[PDB]
C-alpha cells in the first residue's frame, strides 16, 4: 500500500521490487517482477502508480491497492529501457531505450498521438526532462548530449569529450545548472538556458570537477538546489555544493579490508524534500539511509536477496 506522504522502494536482481518506509526498516509489500531485471523505476506524480522499466517492457504496479502483478505493460521496443519518466501533470511518458531511441508515450486510451521518436547513432544511457517540461537531455554511449526541445524538431548535440560513454545527467528544480558524468568520473557542469522567454538554450561550460577515479554511475541534484550527490564505482557517494563546487560530504561503504575487493558499487541515490537525509542504493544486497551532515549512516534495509541497482524515493512537497 502507499497511503503515506513518503514512499520508498528498491529493485534489483532478486526478481522482486521491495516497498518499505523509514520508520523501522520493515518491508510492507514485495511486488513480483520476473523474467527480467529492473533498470529504473519511477513513481507517477499523482502518486497512484509506479513504473519499472527493464529489458523491452515497462510494467506498472498499483500503489493504492495490493496487486503483485503488472496491471499495465508497455512493449514494442527491442532492447532495454534505460530510464523512464512522466509529465508533472501525468500527460506523457519519456522513455529512453537501449537500442537507438528516446521516445514519447501517451498515457490515455485515446488517439491523441503526441508521441514522437528521437534517433541517434549511439545506444543511449540517460534521459532527463527539463523542469519547465519543454526540453529534454539525451546522453548516449558516444559522450554526446542531445538537447532536444519538444516544441520544435531540431536538436543540439554537444560533445565535451569523445571516446568515453556518459552515464547520467540531471537539472536542479530551481533551474540553475546542468551537470553530467561519464565513464572516467569527470563531472562537467554547463550553465543551462537562462532564456526563460523563447527557449534560446544557450550553454556555457562553467566547471569540470575531477574526482571519482573509477566509473561514475549516477549524478543527481537536490530539490533545494544547494547540493549535488554523485555515486561512483569506488564504493563512494560524494555530495558537493553549488556555491564554489567544493566537496561538502564524503560517504563510503568500504570496509578497509583487502579481502573484499569492491564487494558492491554505489548505484543510485536520491534526496528528500528538506535536502537533509538521503537514501542510497548499494549493490551489497541492502539499501542505506545517510545524513548529509553527520556522515554516519542512520538506517538500513536488508530484505533483498541479490544486488539492487535502482531505487525510488518521493515525499511530500513540504520539507
Amino acid at each position: 500500500v502507499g497511503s503515506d506522504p513518503v514512499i520508498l522502494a528498491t529493485a534489483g536482481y532478486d526478481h522482486t521490487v521491495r516497498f518499505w518506509q523509514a520508520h523501522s526498516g520493515i518491508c510492507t509489500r514485495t511486488v513480483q517482477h520476473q523474467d527480467s531485471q529492473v533498470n529504473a523505476l519511477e513513481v507517477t506524480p499523482d502518486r497512484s502508480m509506479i513504473a519499472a522499466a527493464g529489458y523491452q517492457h515497462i510494467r506498472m504496479y498499483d500503489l493504492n491497492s495490493n496487486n503483485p502483478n503488472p496491471i499495465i505493460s508497455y512493449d514494442g521496443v527491442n532492447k532495454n529501457i534505460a530510464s523512464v519518466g512522466f509529465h508533472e501533470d501525468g500527460r506523457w511518458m519519456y522513455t529512453g531505450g537501449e537500442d537507438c531511441t528516446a521516445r514519447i508515450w501517451d498515457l490515455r486510451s485515446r488517439n491523441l498521438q503526441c508521441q514522437r521518436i528521437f534517433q541517434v547513432n549511439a545506444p543511449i544511457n540517460c534521459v532527463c526532462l527539463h523542469p519547465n517540461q519543454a526540453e529534454l537531455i539525451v546522453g548516449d554511449q558516444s559522450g554526446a548530449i542531445h538537447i532536444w526541445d519538444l516544441k520544435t524538431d531540431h536538436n543540439e548535440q554537444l560533445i565535451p569529450e569523445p571516446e568515453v560513454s556518459i552515464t547520467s545527467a540531471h537539472i536542479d528544480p530551481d533551474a540553475s545548472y546542468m551537470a553530467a558524468v561519464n565513464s572516467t568520473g569527470n563531472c562537467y557542469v554547463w550553465n543551462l538556458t537562462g532564456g526563460i522567454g523563447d527557449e534560446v538554450t544557450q550553454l556555457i561550460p562553467k566547471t569540470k570537477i575531477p574526482a571519482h577515479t573509477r566509473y561514475a554511475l549516477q549524478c543527481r541534484f537536490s530539490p533545494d538546489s544547494t547540493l549535488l550527490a554523485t555515486c561512483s564505482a569506488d564504493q563512494t557517494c560524494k555530495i558537493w555544493r553549488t556555491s564554489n563546487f567544493s566537496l561538502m560530504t564524503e560517504l563510503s561503504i568500504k570496509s578497509g579490508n583487502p579481502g573484499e575487493s569492491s564487494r558492491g558499487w554505489m548505484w543510485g541515490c536520491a534526496f528528500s524534500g528538506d535536502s537533509q537525509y538521503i537514501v542510497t542504493a548499494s549493490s551489497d544486497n541492502l539499501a542505506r539511509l545517510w545524513c548529509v551532515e553527520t556522515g554516519e549512516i542512520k538506517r538500513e534495509y536488508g530484505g533483498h536477496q541479490k544486488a539492487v541497482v535502482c531505487l525510488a524515493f518521493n515525499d511530500s512537497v513540504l520539507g
Binding site: 502483478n69 503488472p70 496491471i71 499495465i72 505493460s73 508497455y74 512493449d75
Partner: peptide
C-alpha cells in the same frame, strides 16, 4: 479422452491469464 482435459486446461488457465493490458 485427451482433448477434453486439454480443453479444461486451456479454459482454466485462460480464465486466469487475461487480466492485464498490453
Amino acid at each position: 479422452s485427451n482433448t477434453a482435459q486439454r480443453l479444461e486446461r486451456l479454459r482454466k488457465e485462460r480464465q486466469n491469464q487475461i487480466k492485464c493490458k498490453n
